[PDB]
UniProtKB/Swiss-Prot annotation:
Major location category of this protein: plastid
Key word Acetylation present: no
Keywords of this entry: Chloroplast, Ion transport, Membrane, Plastid, Plastid outer membrane, Porin, Transmembrane, Transmembrane beta strand, Transport
Annotated family: Belongs to the plastid outer envelope porin OEP21 (TC 1.B.29) family.
Tissue: Present in roots, shoots and leaves.
The protein's name: Outer envelope pore protein 21, chloroplastic
Annotated GO CC locations: chloroplast outer membrane; etioplast membrane; pore complex
Chloroplast intermembrane side: 32-55, 92-97, 131-137, 163-168
Length: 177
């Protein structure tokens, strides 16, 4: 049971996201997140994951979905009122020191139940080293993205905060409570 604050600009001011885990079977984990609205004091959205792990092939396979609440659909459409589901492998590779990178990725496909839309994603954070500035302030870059043909937004770590930019002119912070 952990809680994280998500700040937003050019979209939403503040929102809370909290994470919980449940044991269903010997080799099956429940992992889900609850988003409480910007208004503060009500639901907003829900997401969940069902996963299994392999030992020698250190990785997990599972599916992820999200539910957005229904309101009205017809001539016009809205961001809400939509269900999506995806299945992917999760893998982590530390290639720093010997190399220079480190990533945690989600490799798979998602469909939007609303319009037959299907995409594959580098649903990942890939650690790469770029700066080239006189200042000695080290920064780490990872694309909080689904790479294939959809949308990348960047995530960087500085001091002890995580902040991002999306091509839609959207930005955010994530900080643990």
């Amino acid at each position: 049971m952990e809680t994280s604050l998500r700040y937003g600009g050019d979209s939403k001011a503040l929102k809370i996201h909290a994470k919980e885990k449940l044991r269903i079977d010997t080799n099956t984990f429940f992992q889900v997140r609850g988003g409480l609205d910007t208004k503060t004091g009500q639901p907003s959205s829900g997401s969940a994951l069902i996963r299994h792990f392999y030992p020698n092939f250190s990785a997990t396979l599972g599916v992820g979905v999200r539910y957005d609440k229904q309101d009205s659909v017809g001539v016009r459409y809205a961001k809400n009122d939509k269900l999506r589901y995806t299945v992917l492998a999760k893998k982590t590779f530390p290639v720093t020191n010997d190399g220079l990178v480190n990533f945690k990725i989600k490799g798979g496909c998602d469909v939007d139940q609303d319009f037959k839309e299907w995409k594959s994603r580098g649903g990942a954070e890939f650690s790469w080293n770029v700066f080239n500035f006189q200042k000695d302030q080290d920064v780490r870059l990872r694309i909080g993205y689904e790479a294939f043909e959809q949308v990348p937004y960047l995530q960087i770590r500085e001091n002890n905060w995580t902040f991002n930019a999306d091509y839609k002119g959207r930005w955010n912070v994530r900080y643990d409570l």
